[PDB]
Amino acid sequence: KKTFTEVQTERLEQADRSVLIKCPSKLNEKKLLQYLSSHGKIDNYFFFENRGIHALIEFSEKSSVASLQAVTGIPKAAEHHVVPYKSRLFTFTLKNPGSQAAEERPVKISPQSHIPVNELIPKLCHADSISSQMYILLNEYQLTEENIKLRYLACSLVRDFARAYFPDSTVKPFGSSVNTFGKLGCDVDMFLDFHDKGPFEMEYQMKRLPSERLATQKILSIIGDCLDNFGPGYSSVQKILNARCPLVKFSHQPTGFQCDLSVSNSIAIRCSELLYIYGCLDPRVRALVFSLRCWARVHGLTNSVPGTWITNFSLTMMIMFFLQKRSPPIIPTLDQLKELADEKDKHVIGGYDCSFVSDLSKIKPTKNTETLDELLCDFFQYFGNFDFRKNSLNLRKGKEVNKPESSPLYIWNPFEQDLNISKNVNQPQLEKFVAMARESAWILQKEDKTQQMINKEPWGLAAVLIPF
Amino acid sequence: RKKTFTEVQTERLEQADRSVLIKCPSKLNEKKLLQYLSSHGKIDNYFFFENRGIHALIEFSEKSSVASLQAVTGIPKHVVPYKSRLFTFTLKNPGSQAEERPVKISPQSHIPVNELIPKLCHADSISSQMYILLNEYQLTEENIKLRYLACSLVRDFARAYFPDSTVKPFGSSVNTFGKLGCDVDMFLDFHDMKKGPFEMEYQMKRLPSERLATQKILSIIGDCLDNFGPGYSSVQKILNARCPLVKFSHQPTGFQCDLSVSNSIAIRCSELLYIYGCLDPRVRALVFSLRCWARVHGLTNSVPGTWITNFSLTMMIMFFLQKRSPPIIPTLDQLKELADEKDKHVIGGYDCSFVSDLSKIKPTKNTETLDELLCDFFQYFGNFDFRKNSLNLRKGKEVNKPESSPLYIWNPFEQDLNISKNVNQPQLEKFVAMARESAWILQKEDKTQQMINKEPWGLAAVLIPFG
Ligand SMILES: Nc1ccn([C@@H]2O[C@H](COP(=O)(O)OP(=O)(O)OP(=O)(O)O)[C@@H](O)[C@H]2O)c(=O)n1
Ligand SMILES: Nc1ccn([C@@H]2O[C@H](COP(=O)(O)OP(=O)(O)OP(=O)(O)O)[C@@H](O)[C@H]2O)c(=O)n1
Ligand SMILES: [Mg+2]
Numbered sequence A: 001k002k003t004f005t006e007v008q009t010e011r012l013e014q015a016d017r018s019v020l021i022k023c024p025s026k027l028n029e030k031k032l033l034q035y036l037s038s039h040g041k042i043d044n045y046f047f048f049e050n051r052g053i054h055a056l057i058e059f060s061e062k063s064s065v066a067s068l069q070a071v072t073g074i075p076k077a078a079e080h081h082v083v084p085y086k087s088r089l090f091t092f093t094l095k096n097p098g099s100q101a102a103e104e105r106p107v108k109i110s111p112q113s114h115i116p117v118n119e120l121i122p123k124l125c126h127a128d129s130i131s132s133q134m135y136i137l138l139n140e141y142q143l144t145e146e147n148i149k150l151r152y153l154a155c156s157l158v159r160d161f162a163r164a165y166f167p168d169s170t171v172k173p174f175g176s177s178v179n180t181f182g183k184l185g186c187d188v189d190m191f192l193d194f195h196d197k198g199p200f201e202m203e204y205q206m207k208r209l210p211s212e213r214l215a216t217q218k219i220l221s222i223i224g225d226c227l228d229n230f231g232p233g234y235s236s237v238q239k240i241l242n243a244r245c246p247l248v249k250f251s252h253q254p255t256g257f258q259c260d261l262s263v264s265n266s267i268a269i270r271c272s273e274l275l276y277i278y279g280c281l282d283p284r285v286r287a288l289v290f291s292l293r294c295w296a297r298v299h300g301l302t303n304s305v306p307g308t309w310i311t312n313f314s315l316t317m318m319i320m321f322f323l324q325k326r327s328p329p330i331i332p333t334l335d336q337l338k339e340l341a342d343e344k345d346k347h348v349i350g351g352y353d354c355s356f357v358s359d360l361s362k363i364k365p366t367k368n369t370e371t372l373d374e375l376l377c378d379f380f381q382y383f384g385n386f387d388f389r390k391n392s393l394n395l396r397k398g399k400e401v402n403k404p405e406s407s408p409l410y411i412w413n414p415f416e417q418d419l420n421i422s423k424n425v426n427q428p429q430l431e432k433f434v435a436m437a438r439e440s441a442w443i444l445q446k447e448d449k450t451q452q453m454i455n456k457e458p459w460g461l462a463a464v465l466i467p468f
Numbered sequence B: 001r002k003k004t005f006t007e008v009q010t011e012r013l014e015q016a017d018r019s020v021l022i023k024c025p026s027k028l029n030e031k032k033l034l035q036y037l038s039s040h041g042k043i044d045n046y047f048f049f050e051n052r053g054i055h056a057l058i059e060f061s062e063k064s065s066v067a068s069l070q071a072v073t074g075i076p077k078h079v080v081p082y083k084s085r086l087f088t089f090t091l092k093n094p095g096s097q098a099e100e101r102p103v104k105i106s107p108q109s110h111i112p113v114n115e116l117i118p119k120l121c122h123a124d125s126i127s128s129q130m131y132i133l134l135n136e137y138q139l140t141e142e143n144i145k146l147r148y149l150a151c152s153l154v155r156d157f158a159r160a161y162f163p164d165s166t167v168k169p170f171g172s173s174v175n176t177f178g179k180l181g182c183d184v185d186m187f188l189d190f191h192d193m194k195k196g197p198f199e200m201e202y203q204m205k206r207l208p209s210e211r212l213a214t215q216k217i218l219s220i221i222g223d224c225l226d227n228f229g230p231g232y233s234s235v236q237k238i239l240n241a242r243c244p245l246v247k248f249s250h251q252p253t254g255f256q257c258d259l260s261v262s263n264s265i266a267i268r269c270s271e272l273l274y275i276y277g278c279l280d281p282r283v284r285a286l287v288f289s290l291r292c293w294a295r296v297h298g299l300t301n302s303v304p305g306t307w308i309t310n311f312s313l314t315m316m317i318m319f320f321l322q323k324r325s326p327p328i329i330p331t332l333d334q335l336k337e338l339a340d341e342k343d344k345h346v347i348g349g350y351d352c353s354f355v356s357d358l359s360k361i362k363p364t365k366n367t368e369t370l371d372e373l374l375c376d377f378f379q380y381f382g383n384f385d386f387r388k389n390s391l392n393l394r395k396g397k398e399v400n401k402p403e404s405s406p407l408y409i410w411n412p413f414e415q416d417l418n419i420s421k422n423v424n425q426p427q428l429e430k431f432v433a434m435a436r437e438s439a440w441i442l443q444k445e446d447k448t449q450q451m452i453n454k455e456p457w458g459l460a461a462v463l464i465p466f467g
């Protein structure tokens, strides 16, 4: 019965006691771990390729990090010419390169990126059914245990800067990184949450802060500067402080992730939890999202830069809606969750009741037995013939409703009164989605699967994951 | 039996290390406060001073007493929750007390010049006058403790990002020539069987120079002082100067400060000047009075420019004292010869070695009174040939000028560096004029008759403007 909030805490606690070691060219796995173990017990570890062999070490005790740091030196080779900020990024070399005294064995490399689309298409064609195809993609794309540990670590490193002056700060991931829908190679979205008996009243002297937004801008501005200059391995630091939600984008060389740092927004975190739930409730949920996400990227309906396009988040929200409207529903409405919540799970933010259940056992498993074969096609059919001018998507009620605005695509932000999450989406783009969906359905409906396999040509999911 | 500069520094820092600052209540009971505080630990020293309210410095005998006190201190229930050694004490029930006896206030600034002039006139001889000024101006024990503390706080603050930092004062603050109200010059310095088969080290960015890193470290610390650190204002990032710098005002101790990254050449100066000042009271006496003289006659200025700097002026005075018969202080080379391998320091190519122990130096036989030395100083430099000669403190001799600057003073720890390169002809000439006027007055003045008149005499006669 592991709640999102539970899982997050354990993950953070583990990344908290983890480090990164750039390995020697000729690496002896055993001698390394044997050595390191001297500083403390090791719960987990793995190796990955990134401009050389790096290795993530997760000690059982946080004290092991101090222990290891205690015997780590500053590069005297390059001595006064560096910024002497110490963190958990280490570089190991052999004292005596000519004292190599055991058999060189290779090391297992955990992959941190997924295969390209073109490499995937063949594998999909050799599958049996569509269900299989979708589940292949899912597996080939989803985040690995190692990848996750690596994401949480990246957050943990960024935190360490914040604590300098807000000891109680936390850097926590949200979005795809933690909501079960993360594909390999995605960005790590980080939220900085910073504040959280004599005859005398004795008090610390402490410098006052400005307004929420103005302080936010300054804290991020300074952290940004530190990432850049105390580093190491932070590049393309981009201070985008003036947006609706102040932001620092940056590229982290050691973990390979590009990242987005912003100050805690508890509305966005509740989304990520809600999506965490849905994803956990049924594998069909995840399967669909991943495939339809890929579909969208393939047909240029989505884009890595913001704009008039649909965002994966909105698209994900549309999919959740779709799954709410099954007979019977595959996932419950948000209100159905709110009803099952106890006082423990009561959260009310910015006026609006963002309450819903945390324990998954409280929810009744779905009776629905639809295969993905159907759900994939039905999705295209459903939205292909959806009346976007007359209707909007409400995930609280799980019903089509009247539009409180005159935007082309309106999706009810579930944790705000009166907010369109697809407000950015224009008519031209929406129309292309509908076209692409209607083409996609038509193909799936009127295609000869058995005969396409025989011809070696694409079919099912593959037929809609190639451009038209 | 005296102690090395390096010794004294360490003991001072160690004491400031276990000290805090308490903003006191309006109605303050000295006894109840100390009685209370003593519960957390034994108290070696303490004092009170006025600065936008009554503040108090408490030096515990144990560093553990600071933790003890912090353990019962709350956050003001907004703010940047950086916890340090700045506390604010108030009464639970203000209006049920009555309690306030007065308190003794250690003064952190010296009296103005105009208040000093009378006191100087009522003295007996010039020696006395110079020693009065010295005392009225020099740093008090309390003031010093307060300076070291200021450094200690910045260290703790720096340690937030660089756990292995030290912040150490240099310059007038520690070289024995500090007058009250002067800036605290801080140097940020970084300093810290093998079991395995690996050489393990940190991943850190390679920057082209030491200078470029220095600029970034200070830039970021500066920003933090400004936005996070308590009681830091007027932060001025002056990163591009010869020695990158952050100036800032520390409200609690009242000091304006100057943060820079450790420069070991500047520290050796401070030690050298520490030595000279310690060797003889005449040394200090002279410097303080002539420093004041210069300020009075606008030969020096608080902003940089074509003026002479107190440092250069101090260097000229040291030179003057080297050229006595017999010398009052030894040359720098005379010190270098008395240094052991223990005191060998060689930085940036140049041998900056000299003795640390003062007993190794033979006490000066010279017995000249200040009466003479003050006048002689004006005479000496009044008739000095600045166009043909330069001041070398290593040799203690006038030498040919390696450049064609008007006033050339050999930087003792560098190669071909003029410390008074900034000084132009017009300004130099005004110094010489002022010196020659100053000497003439002292030489041809009727001391006894000026006292009878009530008008100024001796040091006072040269510490009033010539309008
Ligand atoms: N209009 C929006 C957009 C985003 N968010 C929140 O901010 C997060 C960050 O956005 P994004 O990174 O696009 O979400 P991901 O699901 O991480 O998308 P992707 O798979 O493309 O990384 C979202 O997850 C969501 O919780 C929101 O509340 N309202
Ligand atoms: N041309 C110069 C100027 C300054 N310094 C060094 O910078 C240090 C600090 O400079 P400053 O604070 O100006 O010296 P103080 O004697 O502290 O000046 P003041 O009496 O005005 O406080 C000095 O110890 C000196 O070694 C130097 O080496 N060469
Ligand atoms: Mg993202």
Ligand SMILES: [Mg+2]
Binding pocket: B171, B172, B173, B182, B183, B184, B185
């Ligand atoms: Mg100074």
